[model samples]
Every structure is written in C-alpha cells, then in structure tokens.
Target: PLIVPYNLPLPGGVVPRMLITILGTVKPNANRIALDFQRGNDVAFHFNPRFNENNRRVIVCNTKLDNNWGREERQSVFPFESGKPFKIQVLVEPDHFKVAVNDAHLLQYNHRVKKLNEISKLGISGDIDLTSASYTMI
Candidate 1:
C-alpha cells in the first residue's frame, strides 16, 4: 500500500495568480479523496470528492477553522472514478480559487479565510496514489 495522507509545505505560501497542480490515481476501492489548503490549524479550502457517500455522487468543498467545518458547497458533476488517474489544478486569485479537474473547469471557491498569503500547506488524503504534486506562482 502507498503511504497516504501526504502533507507538504507550500513554499512562500499562496499568492494571487498562483496555480497548484495535483496528479494522482484513485485507488481501485476508493471511497473518497480530499485536497486541502491549509495555514496553521485553519484549512483555507477543502476539496472533497466522494464516490460512495450514501450512493450519492458529489464533490463537497468547504473550509475549516478551529476544527469546525463551514458550510459545504456541493457540485454534482463528478469527473473522478475508481482506479482512474486524474489531474487537478487549483488556481489562486485575489478573491477566489478556480479549480480544474482533468483539464476541465470544475468550479470556483470564494475566499473564506481572506488571507490567502497565509495558506502555506498542501494536504492530500484518502484513497489515492499521488504521482506528482506541484505549485507555480504566476
């Protein structure tokens, strides 16, 4: 089994016009996957894709502070499948973050933490095999 729940530092934190990319493969028995952008104890954004939650297909996005989860934004279009490879891109903007999955536009999340520059960590968890992960400041 691959070592999971990977957490890595985002050098210099996140800035406006920056892009982060995650390349991974869903486990054959994948139930869920999450990509989190964090700063200290606060998670600026959580992008969760659930494959078998109540038999409902969806992607849940949210933020967390002090271990409390915020309102979840759900998207019905799921582009992930078990045993498949995927590429996800998270682009940081001044007011929101734009997401693209498998080279397709997924959605945009408005800034909840406000201080984008404070987000200095990238966390990945759940049933996935990460092939590559990187970020570029643009």
Candidate 2:
C-alpha cells in the first residue's frame, strides 16, 4: 500500500550556508507538509553528546502551511524558544515522509527524490544548536 522504505539520518557532516526548508511529502499526488524557515537556511549541526562521537541532533519541525495548492505560499513555524529543547522525527515512508515530534504527526511534506538517496539534504545556514536527532526509516 506504499512505495518504498528509506532512512536518511543526520550523518555527521558539515553543510555550508544555504536557505533550506525542512519539509515532508506524502502521497506525491496529494498530501505533503512544508515549513519555510523564518531565516533562510540558518541552522548548524553538532555532534549529539548522547550518541556516538559522530551522531547528530536534529530539530523535528512543524508545518507552516495553510491549505492545499498553497505550497509556494507557506511559511515555517519553528518552535525555537531560545532555551527550550525540541525533538523532530522525520519518517520517510514508501510514498512520503511523515514528520512528527515526540509521538504526534504534526505535518507531512511531499518528498521528491531524484536519486536513490535516503537523507534529502535541505540546505541549511545560521548557528543553531543541534543536540541529538534520529530518523526512523520505515
């Protein structure tokens, strides 16, 4: 009842500055979720202290979309509260990515994969702190 199973976690790596939008894509032809950064690609990834020396923490973000067919007009709603820590779980299913936090499916963005790549590199920027993050590939 789906497409495929792929998992692309935040493998230890440094990506230069770039405007990025962390989104999800489900059912390609119908459903998806997108969160446009308030400040284009302004995030820095660091090694998550809890995991291995190369493990990284990522933010499980929420969608800023309003309606259908309004993909280009959506905005990003990051829950960055200065000192508050949040978890962003992005699920890459057969047809789409079901992004969630804690255990709630907040949003689903349409994932477009050109190659057989697991982690879709959404170009990032800024100096945000990444504590620890993991991607559940199913």
Candidate 3:
C-alpha cells in the first residue's frame, strides 16, 4: 500500500473531462479519512468521510482557499464501511466534480475555484490503505 498523507503532482492540470481514480481499502476500525485536490496551498476540493459521528456517519465535502475553508457540504447516507475496498472516481467537468464510490454515484460538488489550470497536486490522508491513485486524459 502507498503511504498515507501521500501526495502527487497533477501536471495533467486536472482540467475538465479528466478522470481521476483512487483505489483503497478502509482498514477495519477506520475512523475518518480525507482526499484532497489541491493547488499548492489552496485545497480546491476536500472529500472527507467520518465513519462515526456521534455514533452516526457522514461525508463532508468542501473547498479551502487562502488557507480558509468554506461551508461544509455534508451527506449522511453512509456509503462506506470498515475493511471494505473502495474505488473512487472524480469526473472533472467544466463547472463541477462528479464523484462516485465503488462504481456507484456518490455526490457532486460545484466548482468553487474556477481556475483548474493551477491545480498542481492532490493527496490523501488518514485511515485507509491506499492502493493507487491515477488520472486519465482530457
């Protein structure tokens, strides 16, 4: 498995119509994990899942710019669980991101940072065994 807090350069520019994929398995007893699409110090997208939130579960997506985070968009459907392998795909579109997990549609986030050309890096951290992360062409 790749190391956590793993970071990679997105020189592909992460532009519209690009497809990003992440494969990983949630360790048994997993708590929370975060996957981010970044532009240097700015986090263009933050995909976070908390396995237990007050005994419940939720996924929170948000954007961070100038080191400040925006309003969190939360979903409580609980699409993930411990010890399970997951395949996540983010379809980069002109105005938004279409996200899916385990080959199923999860959620979508409208663009907060309109300039994708500078989105140079992406990373993941917290409780998961990352298999691999890759991206496809425009």
Candidate 4:
C-alpha cells in the first residue's frame, strides 16, 4: 500500500482533480483494481486488467454521489510510469467516467463507453511510480 493524501474533503455532485506520479520502479505485477461505485444493486464503476493489451489503463467512473475513490462514480487512468508525473481530473455532476489524463494536454480515457449502471471500479496496474495523486470535488 501507499501513503497518499487527497486534495480536499470531497463533496457530493461536484468535480475534482488528482495529480498522480509514479514514485518507484516496483510495479504491481498483479492487477491493481479500483474499488466500485454503487447505486442499490448496481455498481457505478470499476478498474480491472485486460490481458495481452499494450494500453492496460482502464479509466472508468459511475457519476452519482461525488467525485471520489470512496464512491463508485470515481474513475482512473493507468499504465502510468513511476518516473513520469501526471494529472487526473474527476468531474462528478451526474454519475460517470468523465475524464482521465496525464497533464492538461492528455486525455487518458473515458467512461462513457458503458451505461451508467455498468460502471463499477477505477484502479491501475503494471510497472510504474507515483509523483503525485491528488483530486478535487465539484
């Protein structure tokens, strides 16, 4: 596990941003899946590994409660290396994977590919480090 702090205390129905930079060469050989977002029986979002793929980052979200890891609406972007620093913005107004990025320039991935109910978790895996991992809530 890692010791990281949030940008702020998250609130409901708001947008936020997180800056995550990998810190070590020790990558997660196992899949580092993000937790799930939920609404009753359905999960909002989740991050799992895809086999035999070059881009293994899964940026997903379930936009419902708020923009946070504590909620299912929270999404992620991965395959980020440890030496490289990046930024991830989380926008939670309705309930979905809005955007993931490395900087103000790169759009890592999106969660709109699936229905709102299909979103379950947001996590990352592979060789990398973390420079910064921060977020804000709308």
| Lowest lDDT block of 10, candidate 4 | 5-14
**Per-prediction tally of clashes:** 0, 16, 0, 35
Winning candidate number (lDDT):
1
lDDT of 3 by residue, 46-127 (tens): 9999998898899999999998999999987667889999998999988898998988888989989878988878888889
Estimated TM-score per prediction? 0.95, 0.38, 0.95, 0.36
Model 4 spans > 4 angstroms off? 4-43, 48-82, 104-134
Better of 2 and 3 by TM-score: 3
Write candidate 1's Cα lDDT for 8-107 as tens digits: 6887679888899988899897899998999889999999999988998799999999999999999999999899999999999888989999999999
- Per-residue lDDT for 11 in model 4? 27
Clash count (model 4, backbone only):
35
Candidate 1: Cα lDDT at 51: 93
Off by over 4 Å in 1: none
lDDT of 2 by residue, 13-125 (tens): 21222112232222212112222221122221111111111342233333222222222212143332333344455454445445455455555545333222323333322
Candidate 4 residue lDDT tens string, 1-138 = 343221222223122232223233334443332323344334344433222245444434333334444333222335444344444444443433444444343232344334432332333334334344334434
Cα lDDT listed for each candidate: 0.90, 0.31, 0.89, 0.36
Clashes of 2: 16
Model 2 lDDT vs. the true structure?
A: 0.31
State model 4's lDDT.
Answer: 0.36
